[PDB]
PDB file of all heavy atoms in Angstrom:
ATOM      1  N   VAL B  94     -15.614  15.401 -23.981  1.00 59.39           N
ATOM      2  CA  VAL B  94     -15.681  14.261 -24.907  1.00 59.39           C
ATOM      3  C   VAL B  94     -15.640  15.010 -26.287  1.00 59.39           C
ATOM      4  O   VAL B  94     -16.120  16.103 -26.378  1.00 59.39           O
ATOM      5  CB  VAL B  94     -16.984  13.463 -24.814  1.00 59.39           C
ATOM      6  CG1 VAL B  94     -17.226  12.725 -26.033  1.00 59.39           C
ATOM      7  CG2 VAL B  94     -16.997  12.648 -23.584  1.00 59.39           C
ATOM      8  N   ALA B  95     -15.009  14.370 -27.251  1.00 60.35           N
ATOM      9  CA  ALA B  95     -14.922  14.838 -28.598  1.00 60.35           C
ATOM     10  C   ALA B  95     -14.151  16.162 -28.832  1.00 60.35           C
ATOM     11  O   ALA B  95     -14.232  16.697 -29.976  1.00 60.35           O
ATOM     12  CB  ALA B  95     -16.346  15.018 -29.166  1.00 60.35           C
ATOM     13  N   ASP B 124     -10.448   5.641 -19.086  1.00 58.69           N
ATOM     14  CA  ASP B 124     -11.509   4.759 -19.599  1.00 58.69           C
ATOM     15  C   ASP B 124     -11.489   3.515 -18.776  1.00 58.69           C
ATOM     16  O   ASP B 124     -12.592   3.139 -18.315  1.00 58.69           O
ATOM     17  CB  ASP B 124     -11.008   4.278 -21.008  1.00 58.69           C
ATOM     18  CG  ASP B 124     -11.728   5.114 -22.137  1.00 58.69           C
ATOM     19  OD1 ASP B 124     -12.567   6.040 -21.777  1.00 58.69           O
ATOM     20  OD2 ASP B 124     -11.373   4.915 -23.364  1.00 58.69           O
ATOM     21  N   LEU B 127     -13.510   2.991 -15.414  1.00 57.42           N
ATOM     22  CA  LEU B 127     -14.907   3.179 -15.259  1.00 57.42           C
ATOM     23  C   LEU B 127     -15.396   1.863 -14.631  1.00 57.42           C
ATOM     24  O   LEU B 127     -14.755   0.833 -14.857  1.00 57.42           O
ATOM     25  CB  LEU B 127     -15.593   3.193 -16.695  1.00 57.42           C
ATOM     26  CG  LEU B 127     -15.553   4.489 -17.441  1.00 57.42           C
ATOM     27  CD1 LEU B 127     -15.943   4.278 -18.814  1.00 57.42           C
ATOM     28  CD2 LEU B 127     -16.628   5.449 -16.792  1.00 57.42           C
ATOM     29  N   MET B 139     -25.781   3.579 -15.544  1.00 54.77           N
ATOM     30  CA  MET B 139     -25.526   3.354 -16.987  1.00 54.77           C
ATOM     31  C   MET B 139     -25.717   4.571 -17.871  1.00 54.77           C
ATOM     32  O   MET B 139     -25.397   4.488 -19.093  1.00 54.77           O
ATOM     33  CB  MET B 139     -26.446   2.216 -17.435  1.00 54.77           C
ATOM     34  CG  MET B 139     -25.911   0.806 -17.168  1.00 54.77           C
ATOM     35  SD  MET B 139     -24.132   0.619 -17.849  1.00 54.77           S
ATOM     36  CE  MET B 139     -24.506  -0.166 -19.446  1.00 54.77           C
ATOM     37  N   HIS B 140     -26.347   5.586 -17.437  1.00 54.03           N
ATOM     38  CA  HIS B 140     -26.570   6.793 -18.247  1.00 54.03           C
ATOM     39  C   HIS B 140     -25.825   7.957 -17.668  1.00 54.03           C
ATOM     40  O   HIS B 140     -26.163   9.097 -17.753  1.00 54.03           O
ATOM     41  CB  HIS B 140     -27.964   7.132 -18.387  1.00 54.03           C
ATOM     42  CG  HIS B 140     -28.850   6.243 -19.212  1.00 54.03           C
ATOM     43  ND1 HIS B 140     -29.683   5.258 -18.782  1.00 54.03           N
ATOM     44  CD2 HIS B 140     -28.720   5.986 -20.602  1.00 54.03           C
ATOM     45  CE1 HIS B 140     -30.241   4.402 -19.740  1.00 54.03           C
ATOM     46  NE2 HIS B 140     -29.592   4.875 -20.986  1.00 54.03           N
ATOM     47  N   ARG B 141     -24.641   7.575 -16.958  1.00 55.67           N
ATOM     48  CA  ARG B 141     -23.814   8.662 -16.379  1.00 55.67           C
ATOM     49  C   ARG B 141     -22.343   8.341 -16.706  1.00 55.67           C
ATOM     50  O   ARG B 141     -21.539   8.877 -15.942  1.00 55.67           O
ATOM     51  CB  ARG B 141     -24.183   8.591 -14.912  1.00 55.67           C
ATOM     52  CG  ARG B 141     -25.606   8.970 -14.594  1.00 55.67           C
ATOM     53  CD  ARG B 141     -25.799  10.475 -14.593  1.00 55.67           C
ATOM     54  NE  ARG B 141     -25.152  11.154 -13.435  1.00 55.67           N
ATOM     55  CZ  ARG B 141     -25.285  12.401 -13.228  1.00 55.67           C
ATOM     56  NH1 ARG B 141     -26.128  13.220 -13.948  1.00 55.67           N
ATOM     57  NH2 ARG B 141     -24.686  12.929 -12.144  1.00 55.67           N
ATOM     58  N   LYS B 142     -22.081   7.407 -17.631  1.00 53.21           N
ATOM     59  CA  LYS B 142     -20.726   7.179 -17.986  1.00 53.21           C
ATOM     60  C   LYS B 142     -19.946   8.456 -18.312  1.00 53.21           C
ATOM     61  O   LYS B 142     -20.189   9.180 -19.304  1.00 53.21           O
ATOM     62  CB  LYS B 142     -20.692   6.224 -19.186  1.00 53.21           C
ATOM     63  CG  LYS B 142     -20.665   4.753 -18.759  1.00 53.21           C
ATOM     64  CD  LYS B 142     -20.330   3.924 -20.028  1.00 53.21           C
ATOM     65  CE  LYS B 142     -20.398   2.449 -19.618  1.00 53.21           C
ATOM     66  NZ  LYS B 142     -20.202   1.580 -20.963  1.00 53.21           N
ATOM     67  N   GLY B 143     -18.929   8.736 -17.535  1.00 49.78           N
ATOM     68  CA  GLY B 143     -18.103   9.901 -17.741  1.00 49.78           C
ATOM     69  C   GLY B 143     -18.312  10.876 -16.618  1.00 49.78           C
ATOM     70  O   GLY B 143     -17.360  11.722 -16.314  1.00 49.78           O
ATOM     71  N   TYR B 148     -16.647   6.316 -12.246  1.00 53.13           N
ATOM     72  CA  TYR B 148     -15.323   5.817 -12.227  1.00 53.13           C
ATOM     73  C   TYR B 148     -14.957   5.266 -10.801  1.00 53.13           C
ATOM     74  O   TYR B 148     -15.314   5.729  -9.756  1.00 53.13           O
ATOM     75  CB  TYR B 148     -14.315   6.943 -12.517  1.00 53.13           C
ATOM     76  CG  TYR B 148     -14.400   7.471 -13.967  1.00 53.13           C
ATOM     77  CD1 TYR B 148     -15.178   8.551 -14.210  1.00 53.13           C
ATOM     78  CD2 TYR B 148     -13.591   6.967 -14.968  1.00 53.13           C
ATOM     79  CE1 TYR B 148     -15.251   9.115 -15.533  1.00 53.13           C
ATOM     80  CE2 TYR B 148     -13.602   7.471 -16.296  1.00 53.13           C
ATOM     81  CZ  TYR B 148     -14.525   8.537 -16.562  1.00 53.13           C
ATOM     82  OH  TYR B 148     -14.588   8.970 -17.872  1.00 53.13           O
ATOM     83  N   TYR B 172     -10.504  -0.641 -20.902  1.00 45.33           N
ATOM     84  CA  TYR B 172     -11.985  -0.576 -21.342  1.00 45.33           C
ATOM     85  C   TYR B 172     -12.092  -0.788 -22.832  1.00 45.33           C
ATOM     86  O   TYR B 172     -11.188  -0.481 -23.629  1.00 45.33           O
ATOM     87  CB  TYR B 172     -12.411   0.824 -21.062  1.00 45.33           C
ATOM     88  CG  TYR B 172     -13.838   1.192 -21.487  1.00 45.33           C
ATOM     89  CD1 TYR B 172     -14.886   0.738 -20.522  1.00 45.33           C
ATOM     90  CD2 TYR B 172     -14.242   1.973 -22.539  1.00 45.33           C
ATOM     91  CE1 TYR B 172     -16.188   1.053 -20.825  1.00 45.33           C
ATOM     92  CE2 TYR B 172     -15.483   2.144 -22.800  1.00 45.33           C
ATOM     93  CZ  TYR B 172     -16.489   1.761 -21.930  1.00 45.33           C
ATOM     94  OH  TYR B 172     -17.870   2.199 -22.213  1.00 45.33           O
ATOM     95  N   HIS B 174     -14.094  -0.069 -26.217  1.00 49.94           N
ATOM     96  CA  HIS B 174     -15.075   0.868 -26.843  1.00 49.94           C
ATOM     97  C   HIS B 174     -15.990   0.100 -27.805  1.00 49.94           C
ATOM     98  O   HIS B 174     -17.171   0.572 -27.956  1.00 49.94           O
ATOM     99  CB  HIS B 174     -14.383   1.965 -27.650  1.00 49.94           C
ATOM    100  CG  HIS B 174     -13.931   3.189 -26.787  1.00 49.94           C
ATOM    101  ND1 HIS B 174     -14.897   4.213 -26.505  1.00 49.94           N
ATOM    102  CD2 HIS B 174     -12.809   3.470 -26.075  1.00 49.94           C
ATOM    103  CE1 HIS B 174     -14.272   5.030 -25.639  1.00 49.94           C
ATOM    104  NE2 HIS B 174     -13.071   4.669 -25.418  1.00 49.94           N
ATOM    105  N   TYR B 177     -18.071  -1.566 -25.187  1.00 49.46           N
ATOM    106  CA  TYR B 177     -18.654  -0.569 -24.266  1.00 49.46           C
ATOM    107  C   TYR B 177     -18.693  -1.031 -22.823  1.00 49.46           C
ATOM    108  O   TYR B 177     -19.587  -0.587 -21.997  1.00 49.46           O
ATOM    109  CB  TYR B 177     -20.157  -0.276 -24.781  1.00 49.46           C
ATOM    110  CG  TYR B 177     -20.868   0.767 -24.106  1.00 49.46           C
ATOM    111  CD1 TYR B 177     -20.591   2.200 -24.118  1.00 49.46           C
ATOM    112  CD2 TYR B 177     -22.211   0.496 -23.411  1.00 49.46           C
ATOM    113  CE1 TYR B 177     -21.378   3.175 -23.489  1.00 49.46           C
ATOM    114  CE2 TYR B 177     -23.072   1.436 -22.803  1.00 49.46           C
ATOM    115  CZ  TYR B 177     -22.585   2.716 -22.859  1.00 49.46           C
ATOM    116  OH  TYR B 177     -23.377   3.731 -22.297  1.00 49.46           O
ATOM    117  N   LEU B 198     -11.710  12.729 -18.787  1.00 47.41           N
ATOM    118  CA  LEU B 198     -12.704  13.850 -18.644  1.00 47.41           C
ATOM    119  C   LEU B 198     -12.426  14.732 -17.431  1.00 47.41           C
ATOM    120  O   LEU B 198     -12.301  15.927 -17.512  1.00 47.41           O
ATOM    121  CB  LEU B 198     -14.095  13.312 -18.617  1.00 47.41           C
ATOM    122  CG  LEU B 198     -14.528  12.597 -20.007  1.00 47.41           C
ATOM    123  CD1 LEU B 198     -15.897  11.840 -19.674  1.00 47.41           C
ATOM    124  CD2 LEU B 198     -14.698  13.588 -20.989  1.00 47.41           C
ATOM    125  N   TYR B 230     -19.126  16.445 -31.901  1.00 34.80           N
ATOM    126  CA  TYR B 230     -19.527  15.293 -31.381  1.00 34.80           C
ATOM    127  C   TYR B 230     -20.578  14.623 -32.388  1.00 34.80           C
ATOM    128  O   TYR B 230     -20.507  13.413 -32.640  1.00 34.80           O
ATOM    129  CB  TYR B 230     -20.309  15.538 -30.042  1.00 34.80           C
ATOM    130  CG  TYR B 230     -20.979  14.307 -29.431  1.00 34.80           C
ATOM    131  CD1 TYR B 230     -20.216  13.331 -28.816  1.00 34.80           C
ATOM    132  CD2 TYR B 230     -22.351  14.069 -29.668  1.00 34.80           C
ATOM    133  CE1 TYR B 230     -20.784  12.154 -28.428  1.00 34.80           C
ATOM    134  CE2 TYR B 230     -22.898  12.935 -29.207  1.00 34.80           C
ATOM    135  CZ  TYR B 230     -22.159  11.983 -28.554  1.00 34.80           C
ATOM    136  OH  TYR B 230     -22.738  10.758 -28.204  1.00 34.80           O
ATOM    137  N   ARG B 233     -18.990  13.486 -35.667  1.00 32.86           N
ATOM    138  CA  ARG B 233     -18.189  12.282 -35.444  1.00 32.86           C
ATOM    139  C   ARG B 233     -19.126  11.084 -35.263  1.00 32.86           C
ATOM    140  O   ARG B 233     -18.767  10.057 -35.612  1.00 32.86           O
ATOM    141  CB  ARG B 233     -17.277  12.528 -34.276  1.00 32.86           C
ATOM    142  CG  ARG B 233     -16.238  11.451 -34.139  1.00 32.86           C
ATOM    143  CD  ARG B 233     -15.120  11.911 -33.277  1.00 32.86           C
ATOM    144  NE  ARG B 233     -15.510  12.145 -31.921  1.00 32.86           N
ATOM    145  CZ  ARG B 233     -15.352  11.358 -30.902  1.00 32.86           C
ATOM    146  NH1 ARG B 233     -14.818  10.075 -31.128  1.00 32.86           N
ATOM    147  NH2 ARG B 233     -15.861  11.540 -29.724  1.00 32.86           N
ATOM    148  N   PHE B 249     -22.959  -0.464 -30.366  1.00 34.60           N
ATOM    149  CA  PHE B 249     -23.838   0.418 -31.056  1.00 34.60           C
ATOM    150  C   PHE B 249     -24.139   0.157 -32.526  1.00 34.60           C
ATOM    151  O   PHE B 249     -24.511   1.109 -33.274  1.00 34.60           O
ATOM    152  CB  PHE B 249     -23.184   1.875 -30.939  1.00 34.60           C
ATOM    153  CG  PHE B 249     -23.041   2.332 -29.503  1.00 34.60           C
ATOM    154  CD1 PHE B 249     -21.880   2.256 -28.818  1.00 34.60           C
ATOM    155  CD2 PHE B 249     -24.111   2.940 -28.829  1.00 34.60           C
ATOM    156  CE1 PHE B 249     -21.699   2.702 -27.588  1.00 34.60           C
ATOM    157  CE2 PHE B 249     -23.901   3.476 -27.606  1.00 34.60           C
ATOM    158  CZ  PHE B 249     -22.742   3.310 -26.947  1.00 34.60           C
ATOM    159  N   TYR B 252     -26.822   1.671 -34.617  1.00 30.10           N
ATOM    160  CA  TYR B 252     -26.770   3.056 -35.069  1.00 30.10           C
ATOM    161  C   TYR B 252     -26.337   3.158 -36.526  1.00 30.10           C
ATOM    162  O   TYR B 252     -26.557   4.269 -37.142  1.00 30.10           O
ATOM    163  CB  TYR B 252     -25.823   3.807 -34.106  1.00 30.10           C
ATOM    164  CG  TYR B 252     -26.518   4.245 -32.880  1.00 30.10           C
ATOM    165  CD1 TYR B 252     -25.687   4.275 -31.702  1.00 30.10           C
ATOM    166  CD2 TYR B 252     -27.804   4.698 -32.683  1.00 30.10           C
ATOM    167  CE1 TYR B 252     -26.301   4.708 -30.430  1.00 30.10           C
ATOM    168  CE2 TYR B 252     -28.315   4.999 -31.525  1.00 30.10           C
ATOM    169  CZ  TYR B 252     -27.601   5.160 -30.365  1.00 30.10           C
ATOM    170  OH  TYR B 252     -28.139   5.573 -29.195  1.00 30.10           O
ATOM    171  N   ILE B 267     -27.956  12.298 -26.797  1.00 22.98           N
ATOM    172  CA  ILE B 267     -26.909  11.831 -25.970  1.00 22.98           C
ATOM    173  C   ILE B 267     -26.124  12.989 -25.385  1.00 22.98           C
ATOM    174  O   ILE B 267     -25.847  13.198 -24.166  1.00 22.98           O
ATOM    175  CB  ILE B 267     -25.982  10.948 -26.607  1.00 22.98           C
ATOM    176  CG1 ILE B 267     -26.710   9.721 -27.148  1.00 22.98           C
ATOM    177  CG2 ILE B 267     -24.860  10.388 -25.657  1.00 22.98           C
ATOM    178  CD1 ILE B 267     -25.898   8.821 -28.084  1.00 22.98           C
ATOM    179  N   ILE B 271     -26.230  13.665 -21.429  1.00 22.04           N
ATOM    180  CA  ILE B 271     -24.983  13.124 -20.725  1.00 22.04           C
ATOM    181  C   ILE B 271     -23.781  13.998 -20.772  1.00 22.04           C
ATOM    182  O   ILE B 271     -23.211  14.435 -19.786  1.00 22.04           O
ATOM    183  CB  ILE B 271     -24.625  11.689 -21.312  1.00 22.04           C
ATOM    184  CG1 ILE B 271     -25.930  10.802 -21.130  1.00 22.04           C
ATOM    185  CG2 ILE B 271     -23.516  11.190 -20.486  1.00 22.04           C
ATOM    186  CD1 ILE B 271     -25.627   9.394 -21.672  1.00 22.04           C
ATOM    187  N   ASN B 272     -23.327  14.218 -22.050  1.00 22.34           N
ATOM    188  CA  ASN B 272     -22.059  14.935 -22.280  1.00 22.34           C
ATOM    189  C   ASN B 272     -22.034  16.449 -22.026  1.00 22.34           C
ATOM    190  O   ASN B 272     -21.073  17.002 -21.483  1.00 22.34           O
ATOM    191  CB  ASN B 272     -21.544  14.653 -23.626  1.00 22.34           C
ATOM    192  CG  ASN B 272     -21.291  13.114 -23.864  1.00 22.34           C
ATOM    193  OD1 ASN B 272     -21.310  12.603 -24.961  1.00 22.34           O
ATOM    194  ND2 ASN B 272     -21.076  12.454 -22.845  1.00 22.34           N
TER     195      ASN B 272
HETATM  196  C1  PAU C 402     -16.944   9.298 -24.004  1.00 28.44           C
HETATM  197  C2  PAU C 402     -17.019   7.975 -23.210  1.00 28.44           C
HETATM  198  C3  PAU C 402     -15.814   7.149 -23.680  1.00 28.44           C
HETATM  199  C4  PAU C 402     -16.802   8.341 -21.673  1.00 28.44           C
HETATM  200  O1  PAU C 402     -16.082   7.242 -21.120  1.00 28.44           O
HETATM  201  C5  PAU C 402     -18.352   7.245 -23.448  1.00 28.44           C
HETATM  202  O2  PAU C 402     -18.191   5.897 -22.835  1.00 28.44           O
HETATM  203  C6  PAU C 402     -19.480   8.005 -23.027  1.00 28.44           C
HETATM  204  O3  PAU C 402     -19.437   9.134 -22.705  1.00 28.44           O
HETATM  205  N1  PAU C 402     -20.614   7.235 -22.866  1.00 28.44           N
HETATM  206  C7  PAU C 402     -21.890   7.757 -22.430  1.00 28.44           C
HETATM  207  C8  PAU C 402     -23.030   6.808 -22.480  1.00 28.44           C
HETATM  208  C9  PAU C 402     -23.408   6.437 -23.884  1.00 28.44           C
HETATM  209  O4  PAU C 402     -22.449   6.572 -24.699  1.00 28.44           O
HETATM  210  O5  PAU C 402     -24.526   6.057 -24.123  1.00 28.44           O
END
Side-chain angles (χ1 to χ4, degrees):
Chain B
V94 161
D124 263 356
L127 277 168
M139 279 304 267
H140 287 107
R141 300 277 288 186
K142 267 189 185 177
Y148 295 88
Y172 184 79
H174 272 279
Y177 185 62
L198 299 166
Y230 176 78
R233 193 159 64 94
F249 296 99
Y252 282 145
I267 303 174
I271 305 177
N272 300 157

